[PDB]
RNA sequence: GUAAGUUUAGAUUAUAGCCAAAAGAGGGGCUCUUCUGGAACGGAAAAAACCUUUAAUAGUGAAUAAUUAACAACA
């Protein structure tokens, strides 16, 4: 088993210098073990990357599967120990830059069946990864305009070079 | 050739209309150039390379006088 | 399938040629009896040499340079 | 386990071709490096030249204010090539500009001077150093050099050649080393002409030439996107330099760019420069 | 291969023999051991031929660094930046000539497929063809099918 | 000669338009010709990839 | 009139062979298009881009929705819709980022 | 138990397929050596295709000026010229002026290549037919 | 014209073709026996068997070979 997620976190950056942005927080957070599919937990978690931490919160409760509610705990805890450890000023200033899930280590067992059969019964498990980053989500992507589309297709007219000659 | 002239050879032009002069540059060799043969069980340890050498030459001067 | 025009006349061509081909070979320029024996030195002078490349196989001498060479291996800074 | 240290070690260098590939190590100077001696590496630089230097204005001319302060900072815990700059810029100036009114004598003396400063831009300077190995050889306080304190070198280097080989090697080095990043370079890259249509009513009437009535020469595809405009100068009812543009405006540009090369020299077929002379 | 490697143009690196010709390889350094077979071949090459390639080629520094060593190697170092390095494990002194001679000629310049064996900076002369060559003009330059 | 390089480039890359007059012509021949003129095959810097090709106009 | 070939529209082609018989002579001075064979510059009253934005106008229920953007797009430079549809990531991914650029 | 390098050897010319052939060697070995076959023929015939993209090169240029393209060539020979045929793209490219001329002197011998077979023989050799 | 051959001694391997094209013999297309040739990366549309082709080497050369086509009847 590899946890270098939480080593992410364990990351301390050199004293910066007057001439130099405030870094933006990043908090890496994960629970290892969880009774889930992480193909179940990828959709929760595809929908959710680049939201805001109060965006995904509100869908998360009223979500119906089980493991958005988990999600919600998981994102809670986060959240709790960014203020509380990782200096961050407002609860609200957060999105999800990143969320997915991993497989996590299974149980094996026979499965029996009425007719003389048998099966290979599995306890799936799963992990669940997610990267806040402090601050706004970034703004959305707007869809090129023709204008746009034309240029492109111009400057590459232009930018066409005559092959195999001298 | 000139701007508004050339000259043409039959099938060489004499020594004395042109004198053309170039330097050396470089002597090196060719990046692998792939050799393999197609034989039934043609097996991955069938194949040679050629890399052949090379030089490099640089044009210098044209000369030119009137000795038509 | 029919003839190209192409091939019927490069056919012709070839066939010419050939023509000329006779036509050298018409006008021997030795008589049989002149041809007779004026080669036949040579041709014994050559076989001689022949023969003699053939039989040179032999097995190789041994010298003990080869063996004393071989210490050479152990060559180093002094 | 596998038993053996061939394979551990050869696994070692799998693990390091790994981490130099994924973290390439931060720049650091061939003078820190192991296997250096400045006084031997001068002395084959010189060499590879073929040229004669003077070792002691030489060594101040890579001399840097930075990399004194350097070593003054750890001595507190030497001559500047300002001297020798001076020397080479100032008569690189005037063998640059020399070099050029020779061969475009019609060349305006404003041309002159935004061509001067472009053959002597940092960059070029920067450029040419580096490639020379220079860097390695510069003496400063900061590894990249600062591209200023570079500058400052090169021309102080051609101080000390001056010095050391006369004006005669040094102007043979300009023309073999400096003159030739020009090839390949057009007039109005290297200087920058606006308004090119006003600018070459002001050189007619310099010479007293009537300003060209401009025609459309050919025109091709004026209503669709792609339009092709040829705009062509006729003095006195002449052609003096025709231009393809997409716009009639942008045809008009370029025609008048085209005379202007034509005013002062610059066809494109004309005499490449000689770098042969041996005097 | 092409597809899945790499590829440049023809190219000098300044313009080198324009003026003067200079030696790209700048730097050589040799590693012997006292004690080793593979050295062999290095030992016997400083005795002899290592003096006549520095009285021809003056301008390359020479590092001569005997010192406990599993294998031999030859570092050549180029005005440019590049780098080499050639194992001598092994290897006798006639290799060894001929291959400081290849260096020596080889620029830093890296070896891999060129495009086209032509580097021009002046490709026209006459003028480039364009459609209009060609073409004849009309009196009043008459677009066709203009009434006018 | 001594043209900009971009300009260059767009001038020799330009397509140009052609009228062609079918009135009591075979369009075979027409054919043949107006593939030339649309394949863009008349140019001498004819390229595969070049996308060089000409509009055709028939009548 | 020696020429075999017309020389209005190129060039003068004067062609020559040497007295001796060696060489060929070629002089080729370019001909300049006659004033009264040109029309005027447009006395009515320019970047590209600027026609590019009234060509693709903006009319109907604001900006146009994606298959009429490239369907307006395709009839401005007489191209298949095909062309202007997206790729995917792998795709994008795998163009090289710095092809070489001589001379 | 240096199998890895030689998977090494394998995957470093199979890192640029598609699929699970990249990432399996049973099938990226294969993909390699027959990438390495296709290279090996492709040699060839780059050669020949070049050939053919001179030909037609050559042919629209020497139409442009009304001229097909065999009788150029055997004019050209006839007077002598032994320009090749990479070379002769080059000059239409970018000497039109030049290759105009060549195309009046071709022409020319043509014309007088016509006016022999003509005049039957019995006329002197033309002024560009000396040879 | 050309360079192998005979004898002595030891010793195995091989011991099932395929197709084209000729000459026979049974059937009267087939069934056999005998002689000849073949195994492209070119060509005949794709084409083991037909045609042009002496080996294999790099080149942004050149000359050629076979080469899917062919131009109603009055005396």
């Given at each position: 088993?590899?946890?270098?997620?939480?080593?992410?976190?364990?990351?301390?950056?050199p004293?910066?210098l007057?001439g130099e942005?405030?870094?933006?927080?990043?908090?890496?957070?994960?629970?290892?073990?969880?009774?889930?599919?992480?193909?179940?937990?990828?959709?929760?978690?595809?929908?959710?990357?680049?939201?805001?931490?109060?965006?995904?919160?509100?869908?998360?409760?009223?979500?119906?599967?089980?493991?958005?509610?988990?999600?919600?705990?998981?994102?809670?805890?986060?959240?709790?120990?960014?203020?509380?450890?990782?200096?961050?000023?407002?609860?609200?200033?957060?999105?999800?830059?990143?969320?997915?899930?991993?497989?996590?280590?299974?149980?094996?067992?026979?499965?029996?069946?009425?007719?003389?059969?048998?099966?290979?019964?599995?306890?799936?498990?799963?992990?669940?990864?997610?990267?806040?980053?402090?601050?706004?989500?970034?703004?959305?992507?707007?869809?090129?305009?023709?204008?746009?589309?034309?240029?492109?297709?111009?400057?590459?007219?232009?930018?066409?070079?005559?092959?195999?000659?001298? | 050739?000139?701007?508004?002239?050339?000259?043409?050879?039959?099938?060489?032009?004499?020594?004395?209309?042109?004198?053309?002069?170039?330097?050396?540059?470089?002597?090196?060799?060719?990046?692998?150039?792939?050799?393999?043969?197609?034989?039934?069980?043609?097996?991955?340890?069938?194949?040679?390379?050629?890399?052949?050498?090379?030089?490099?030459?640089?044009?210098?001067?044209?000369?030119?006088?009137?000795?038509? | 399938?029919?003839?190209?025009?192409?091939?019927?006349?490069?056919?012709?061509?070839?066939?010419?040629?050939?023509?000329?081909?006779?036509?050298?070979?018409?006008?021997?320029?030795?008589?049989?009896?002149?041809?007779?024996?004026?080669?036949?030195?040579?041709?014994?002078?050559?076989?001689?040499?022949?023969?003699?490349?053939?039989?040179?196989?032999?097995?190789?001498?041994?010298?003990?340079?080869?063996?004393?060479?071989?210490?050479?291996?152990?060559?180093?800074?002094? | 386990?596998?038993?053996?240290?061939?394979?551990?070690?050869?696994?070692?260098?799998?693990?390091?071709?790994?981490?130099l590939l994924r973290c390439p190590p931060p720049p650091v100077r061939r003078s820190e490096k192991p296997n250096w001696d400045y006084?031997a590496e001068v002395?084959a630089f010189?060499?590879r030249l073929?040229?004669?230097?003077?070792?002691?204005?030489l060594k101040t001319a890579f001399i840097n204010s930075c990399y004194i302060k350097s070593e003054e900072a750890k001595?507190?815990?030497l001559?500047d090539n300002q001297?020798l700059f001076?020397?080479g810029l100032?008569?690189?100036?005037?063998?640059?500009?020399?070099?050029?009114?020779?061969?475009?004598?019609?060349?305006?003396?404003?041309?002159?001077?935004?061509?001067?400063?472009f053959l002597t831009g940092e960059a070029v300077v920067c450029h040419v150093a580096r490639n020379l190995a220079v860097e390695q050889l510069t003496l400063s306080a900061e590894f990249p050099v600062p591209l200023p304190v570079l500058r400052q070198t090169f021309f102080a280097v051609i101080?000390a050649?001056?010095?050391?080989?006369?004006?005669?090697?040094?102007?043979?080095?300009?023309?073999?080393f400096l003159?030739?990043q020009?090839?390949?370079?057009?007039?109005?890259?290297?200087?920058?002409?606006?308004?090119?249509?006003?600018?070459?009513?002001?050189?007619?009437?310099?010479?007293?030439?009537?300003?060209?009535?401009?025609?459309?020469?050919?025109?091709?595809?004026?209503?669709?996107?792609?339009?092709?405009?040829?705009?062509?100068?006729?003095?006195?009812?002449?052609?003096?330099?025709?231009?393809?543009?997409?716009?009639?405006?942008?045809?008009?540009?370029?025609?008048?760019?085209?005379?202007?090369?034509?005013?002062?020299?610059?066809?494109?077929?004309?005499?490449?420069?000689?770098?042969?002379?041996?005097? | 291969?092409?597809?899945?490697?790499?590829?440049?143009?023809?190219?000098?690196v300044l313009?080198?023999?324009?003026?003067?010709?200079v030696?790209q390889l700048q730097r050589?350094?040799?590693?012997?051991?006292?004690?080793?077979?593979?050295?062999?071949?290095?030992?016997?090459?400083?005795?002899?031929?290592?003096?006549?390639?520095?009285?021809?080629?003056?301008?390359?520094v020479?590092?001569?660094?005997?010192?406990?060593?599993?294998?031999?190697?030859?570092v050549?170092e180029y005005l440019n930046g590049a780098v080499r390095?050639?194992?001598?494990?092994?290897?006798?002194?006639?290799?060894?000539?001929?291959?400081?001679?290849?260096?020596?000629?080889?620029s830093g310049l890296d070896?891999?497929?060129?495009?086209?064996?032509?580097?021009?900076?002046?490709?026209?002369?006459?003028?480039?063809?364009?459609?209009?060559?060609?073409?004849?003009?009309?009196?009043?330059?008459?677009?066709?099918?203009?009434?006018? | 000669?001594?043209?900009?390089?971009?300009?260059?480039?767009?001038?020799?890359?330009?397509?140009?338009?052609?009228?062609?007059?079918?009135?009591?012509?075979?369009?075979?021949?027409?054919?043949?010709?107006?593939?030339?003129?649309?394949?863009?095959?008349?140019?001498?810097?004819?390229?595969?990839?070049?996308?060089?090709?000409?509009?055709?106009?028939?009548? | 009139?020696?020429?075999?070939?017309?020389?209005?529209?190129?060039?003068?082609?004067?062609?020559?062979?040497?007295?001796?018989?060696?060489?060929?002579?070629?002089?080729?001075?370019?001909?300049?298009?006659?004033?009264?064979?040109?029309?005027?510059?447009?006395?009515?009253?320019?970047?590209?881009?600027?026609?590019?934005?009234?060509?693709?106008?903006?009319?109907?229920?604001?900006?146009?929705?994606?298959?009429?953007?490239?369907?307006?797009?395709?009839?401005?430079?007489?191209?298949?819709?095909?062309?202007?549809?997206?790729?995917?990531?792998?795709?994008?991914?795998?163009?090289?980022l710095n092809?070489?650029?001589?001379? | 138990?240096?199998?890895?390098?030689?998977?090494?050897?394998?995957?470093?010319?199979?890192?640029?397929?598609?699929?699970?052939?990249?990432?399996?060697?049973?099938?990226?070995?294969?993909?390699?050596?027959?990438?390495?076959?296709?290279?090996?023929?492709?040699?060839?015939?780059?050669?020949?295709?070049?050939?053919?993209?001179?030909?037609?090169?050559?042919?629209?240029?020497?139409?442009?000026?009304?001229?097909?393209?065999?009788?150029?060539?055997?004019?050209?020979?006839?007077?002598?010229?032994?320009?090749?045929?990479?070379?002769?793209?080059?000059?239409?490219?970018?000497?039109?002026?030049?290759?105009?001329?060549?195309?009046?002197?071709?022409?020319?011998?043509?014309?007088?290549?016509?006016?022999?077979?003509?005049?039957?023989?019995?006329?002197?050799?033309?002024?560009?037919?000396?040879?």
């Amino acid at each position: 088993i590899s946890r270098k997620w939480e080593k992410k976190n364990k990351i301390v950056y050199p004293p910066q210098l007057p001439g130099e942005p405030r870094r933006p927080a990043e908090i890496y957070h994960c629970r290892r073990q969880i009774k889930y599919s992480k193909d179940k937990m990828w959709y929760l978690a595809k929908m959710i990357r680049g939201m805001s931490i109060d965006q995904a919160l509100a869908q998360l409760e009223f979500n119906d599967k089980k493991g958005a509610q988990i999600i919600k705990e998981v994102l809670l805890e986060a959240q709790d120990m960014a203020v509380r450890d990782h200096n961050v000023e407002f609860r609200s200033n957060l999105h999800i830059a990143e969320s997915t899930s991993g497989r996590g280590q299974c149980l094996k067992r026979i499965r029996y069946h009425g007719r003389g059969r048998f099966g290979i019964m599995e306890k799936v498990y799963c992990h669940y990864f997610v990267k806040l980053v402090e601050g706004p989500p970034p703004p959305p992507e707007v869809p090129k305009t023709a204008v746009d589309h034309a240029k492109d297709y111009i400057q590459q007219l232009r930018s066409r070079t005559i092959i195999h000659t001298l | 050739g000139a701007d508004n002239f050339t000259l043409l050879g039959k099938p060489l032009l004499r020594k004395e209309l042109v004198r053309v002069e170039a330097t050396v540059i470089e002597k090196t060799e060719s990046w692998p150039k792939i050799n393999m043969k197609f034989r039934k069980r043609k097996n991955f340890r069938k194949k040679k390379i050629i890399v052949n050498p090379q030089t490099i030459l640089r044009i210098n001067t044209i000369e030119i006088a009137p000795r038509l | 399938r029919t003839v190209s025009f192409q091939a019927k006349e490069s056919m012709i061509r070839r066939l010419e040629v050939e023509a000329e081909n006779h036509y050298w070979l018409s006008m021997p320029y030795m008589t049989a009896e002149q041809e007779c024996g004026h080669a036949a030195e040579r041709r014994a002078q050559a076989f001689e040499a022949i023969k003699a490349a053939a039989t040179s196989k032999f097995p190789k001498h041994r010298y003990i340079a080869d063996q004393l060479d071989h210490l050479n291996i152990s060559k180093k800074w002094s | 386990v596998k038993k053996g240290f061939r394979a551990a070690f050869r696994f070692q260098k799998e693990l390091e071709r790994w981490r130099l590939l994924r973290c390439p190590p931060p720049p650091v100077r061939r003078s820190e490096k192991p296997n250096w001696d400045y006084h031997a590496e001068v002395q084959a630089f010189g060499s590879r030249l073929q040229e004669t230097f003077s070792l002691d204005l030489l060594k101040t001319a890579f001399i840097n204010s930075c990399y004194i302060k350097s070593e003054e900072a750890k001595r507190q815990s030497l001559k500047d090539n300002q001297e020798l700059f001076e020397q080479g810029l100032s008569f690189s100036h005037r063998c640059l500009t020399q070099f050029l009114e020779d061969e475009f004598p019609d060349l305006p003396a404003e041309g002159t001077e935004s061509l001067v400063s472009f053959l002597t831009g940092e960059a070029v300077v920067c450029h040419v150093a580096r490639n020379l190995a220079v860097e390695q050889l510069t003496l400063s306080a900061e590894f990249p050099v600062p591209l200023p304190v570079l500058r400052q070198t090169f021309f102080a280097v051609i101080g000390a050649l001056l010095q050391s080989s006369g004006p005669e090697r040094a102007a043979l080095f300009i023309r073999d080393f400096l003159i030739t990043q020009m090839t390949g370079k057009e007039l109005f890259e290297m200087w920058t002409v606006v308004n090119p249509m006003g600018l070459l009513v002001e050189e007619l009437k310099k010479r007293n030439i009537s300003a060209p009535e401009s025609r459309l020469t050919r025109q091709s595809g004026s209503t669709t996107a792609l339009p092709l405009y040829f705009v062509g100068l006729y003095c006195d009812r002449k052609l003096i330099a025709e231009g393809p543009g997409e716009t009639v405006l942008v045809a008009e540009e370029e025609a008048a760019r085209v005379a202007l090369r034509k005013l002062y020299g610059f066809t494109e077929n004309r005499r490449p420069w000689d770098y042969s002379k041996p005097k | 291969t092409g597809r899945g490697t790499s590829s440049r143009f023809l190219t000098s690196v300044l313009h080198n023999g324009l003026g003067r010709y200079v030696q790209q390889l700048q730097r050589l350094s040799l590693s012997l051991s006292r004690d080793a077979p593979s050295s062999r071949g290095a030992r016997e090459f400083v005795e002899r031929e290592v003096t006549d390639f520095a009285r021809r080629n003056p301008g390359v520094v020479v590092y001569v660094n005997p010192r406990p060593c599993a294998m031999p190697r030859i570092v050549a170092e180029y005005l440019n930046g590049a780098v080499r390095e050639e194992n001598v494990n092994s290897k006798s002194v006639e290799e060894i000539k001929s291959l400081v001679q290849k260096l020596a000629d080889q620029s830093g310049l890296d070896v891999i497929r060129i495009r086209k064996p032509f580097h021009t900076d002046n490709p026209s002369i006459q003028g480039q063809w364009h459609p209009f060559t060609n073409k004849r003009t009309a009196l009043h330059g008459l677009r066709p099918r203009e009434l006018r | 000669s001594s043209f900009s390089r971009a300009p260059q480039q767009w001038a020799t890359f330009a397509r140009m338009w052609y009228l062609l007059d079918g009135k009591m012509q075979p369009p075979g021949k027409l054919a043949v010709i107006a593939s030339n003129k649309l394949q863009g095959l008349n140019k001498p810097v004819y390229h595969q990839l070049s996308d060089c090709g000409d509009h055709v106009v028939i009548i | 009139t020696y020429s075999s070939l017309p020389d209005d529209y190129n060039c003068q082609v004067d062609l020559a062979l040497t007295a001796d018989g060696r060489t060929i002579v070629c002089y080729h001075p370019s001909v300049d298009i006659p004033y009264e064979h040109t029309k005027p510059i447009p006395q009515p009253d320019e970047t590209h881009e600027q026609i590019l934005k009234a060509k693709l106008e903006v009319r109907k229920s604001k900006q146009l929705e994606q298959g009429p953007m490239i369907e307006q797009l395709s009839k401005v430079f007489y191209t298949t819709k095909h062309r202007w549809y997206p790729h995917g990531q792998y795709h994008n991914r795998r163009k090289k980022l710095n092809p070489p650029r001589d001379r | 138990t240096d199998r890895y390098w030689r998977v090494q050897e394998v995957l470093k010319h199979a890192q640029h397929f598609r699929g699970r052939k990249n990432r399996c060697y049973r099938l990226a070995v294969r993909a390699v050596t027959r990438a390495f076959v296709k290279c090996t023929k492709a040699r060839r015939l780059k050669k020949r295709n070049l050939r053919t993209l001179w030909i037609n090169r050559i042919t629209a240029a020497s139409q442009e000026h009304g001229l097909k393209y065999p009788a150029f060539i055997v004019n050209l020979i006839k007077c002598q010229v032994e320009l090749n045929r990479k070379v002769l793209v080059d000059l239409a490219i970018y000497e039109p002026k030049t290759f105009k001329s060549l195309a009046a002197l071709a022409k020319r011998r043509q014309q007088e290549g016509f006016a022999a077979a003509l005049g039957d023989g019995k006329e002197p050799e033309g002024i560009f037919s000396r040879v």
